[PDB]
C-alpha cells in the first residue's frame, strides 16, 4: 500500500501507481510511427545509433534507463553481432523496469519513454515503456501531462500514409496546440538511415514557425 511488496486488498500495489503519477506530471513527449520512421518530439537519447528514446517522467531516473538501454544494445551487438531489433529491446528494458515493482527495497521507476527505431525488416517501430514494464507497439504515442489531450490530435493525424516529412512539422504542431514551448524533434526514418538524430535546424526552426 505504501511498501511495494505489499498488495492493497483490492488488487493492485499503490506504490507502482504513485510512481506512475510522476510521468502524469511532466510535459508531453510525442512520438509518431509513420510510413517510415518515428519522429520523436518532446516539448531525446541516442540509445544506440539504431534506436532513439524520448523520456517523460522525472529526468533523473530516466537517464539511468537510457544508459541501461545503451548497455543492452551493446551486449546484443557483441553477442549476436546484428543490430538489436526494437521489438526485443523494448521487452528487455521493460523487463528491467518491471523488476523494481516486485521487491520492496528498490522503488518503481517514475519514467515512461517511447523508444523507436527504423530498421529495414521491421520498418518503423515505436514502442512505449511504462514504469510497470508494460511495453506495447504504437502507431502514435504521446505521454505526459497532456496525455489524452495530445492523443486527440495524433488521432486527428492519419499517419498510415503520411510521410515522415509532414510529421517532422506535425509533431511540433501537436506540441504547440497542447501547449513557452522549447521544442525538440527527432527523425529516425530511412532518410536518416536509422541514425537517431535531431531534426536539421532549419526544418526545426520552420517547425516552430
Amino acid at each position: 500500500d505504501l511498501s511495494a511488496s505489499t498488495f492493497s486488498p483490492d488488487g493492485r500495489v499503490f506504490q507502482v501507481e504513485y510512481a506512475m503519477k510522476a510521468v502524469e506530471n511532466s510535459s508531453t513527449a510525442i512520438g509518431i510511427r509513420c510510413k517510415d520512421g518515428v519522429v520523436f518530439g518532446v516539448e531525446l537519447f541516442n540509445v544506440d545509433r539504431h534506436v532513439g528514446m524520448a523520456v517523460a517522467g522525472l529526468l533523473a531516473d530516466a537517464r539511468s534507463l537510457a544508459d541501461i538501454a545503451r548497455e543492452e544494445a551493446s551486449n546484443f551487438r557483441s553477442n549476436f553481432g546484428y543490430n538489436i531489433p526494437l521489438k526485443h529491446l523494448a521487452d528487455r528494458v521493460a523487463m528491467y523496469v518491471h523488476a523494481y515493482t516486485l521487491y520492496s527495497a528498490v522503488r518503481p521507476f517514475g519514467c515512461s519513454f517511447m523508444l523507436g527505431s527504423y530498421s529495414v525488416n521491421d520498418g518503423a517501430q515505436l514502442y512505449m515503456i511504462d514504469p510497470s514494464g508494460v511495453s506495447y507497439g504504437y502507431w502514435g504515442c504521446a505521454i505526459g501531462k497532456a496525455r489524452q489531450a495530445a492523443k486527440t490530435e495524433i488521432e486527428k493525424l492519419q499517419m498510415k500514409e503520411m510521410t515522415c516529412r509532414d510529421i517532422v512539422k506535425e509533431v511540433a504542431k501537436i506540441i504547440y496546440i497542447v501547449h513557452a514551448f522549447e521544442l525538440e524533434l527527432s527523425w529516425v526514418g530511412e532518410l536518416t538511415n536509422g541514425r537517431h538524430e535531431i531534426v536539421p535546424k532549419d526544418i526545426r526552426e520552420e517547425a516552430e514557425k
Binding site: T6, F7, D10, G11, H98, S104, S132
Partner: protein, 195 residues
C-alpha cells in the same frame, strides 16, 4: 499482518488471495478446452517453447517475468535432458518458483494465472500465484471465470471456447478481440488459429 506473507489467525495467507483478486482485476477472461485431438486456448498468447504455449492472465507486467522464466526452464530442460519438457513438468516447475514468492516475505506474488496448453495427449494446466497447479479438462481464468466454468461444466472444441466467451462475457466479438491458440495432435507446434 496482511502485508508480509505470514499466516492469519485463520491459517490463511492474505497476500496470496490478494494476488487472486489481482488476477480477477487484470480484466481478461481466458478459457481453454481440451479436445481429444486439439487444445484450444482463447483470450497474451505466448510460445514458451515451440511445442508449448500458455496464456498469462492478470497483471500485464507480471506476465512477462514468468514468461521468461518459463522459457528459461523450458530451454534448460532440453539442455540437461534433451527432449521437450512435458506440459506437466513445466507447470510444476513454474509453480514451484511462484511458491518462492509466498515462502519469502521479501518479495510478492506475481498475479498472473498461467493456462498452459501443449501436447505431452493434450494438456490444459492451470497455475495460481499460490503455487498450486492442476490439470483441468476445460479451464477458465479471469473476470467472468466462474460464469464460464458453469458453461464448461455443462459441456467443435474451438466452438466450445468461442461460444463460451461469447455467451459468458455476453458480447459478440470482433476477431481481433479473441486471440485463439490451437495445438492439434498432428500439430504439436503451438500455433495461433488465426473463425
Amino acid at each position: 499482518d496482511r502485508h508480509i506473507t505470514i499466516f492469519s489467525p485463520e491459517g490463511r495467507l492474505y497476500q496470496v488471495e490478494y494476488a487472486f483478486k489481482a488476477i480477477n482485476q487484470g480484466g481478461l477472461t481466458s478459457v481453454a478446452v481440451r479436445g481429444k485431438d486439439c487444445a484450444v486456448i482463447v483470450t497474451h498468447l505466448f510460445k514458451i517453447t515451440e511445442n508449448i504455449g500458455c496464456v498469462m492472465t492478470g497483471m500485464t507486467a507480471d506476465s512477462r517475468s514468468q514468461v521468461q522464466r518459463a522459457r528459461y526452464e523450458a530451454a534448460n530442460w532440453k539442455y540437461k535432458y534433451g527432449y521437450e519438457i512435458p506440459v506437466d513438468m513445466l507447470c510444476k516447475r513454474i509453480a514451484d518458483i511462484s511458491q518462492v514468492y509466498t515462502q519469502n516475505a521479501e518479495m510478492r506474488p506475481l498475479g498472473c494465472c498461467m493456462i498452459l496448453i501443449g501436447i505431452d495427449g493434450p494438456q490444459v494446466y492451470k497455475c495460481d500465484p499460490a503455487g498450486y497447479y492442476c490439470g483441468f479438462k476445460a479451464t477458465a481464468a479471469g473476470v467472468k471465470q466462474t460464469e464460464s466454468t458453469s458453461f464448461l461444466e455443462k459441456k467443435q472444441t474451438v466452438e466450445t471456447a468461442i461460444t463460451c466467451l461469447s455467451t459468458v462475457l455476453s458480447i459478440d466479438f470482433k476477431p481481433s478481440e479473441i486471440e485463439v491458440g490451437v495445438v492439434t495432435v498432428e500439430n504439436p507446434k503451438f500455433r495461433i488459429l488465426t473463425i
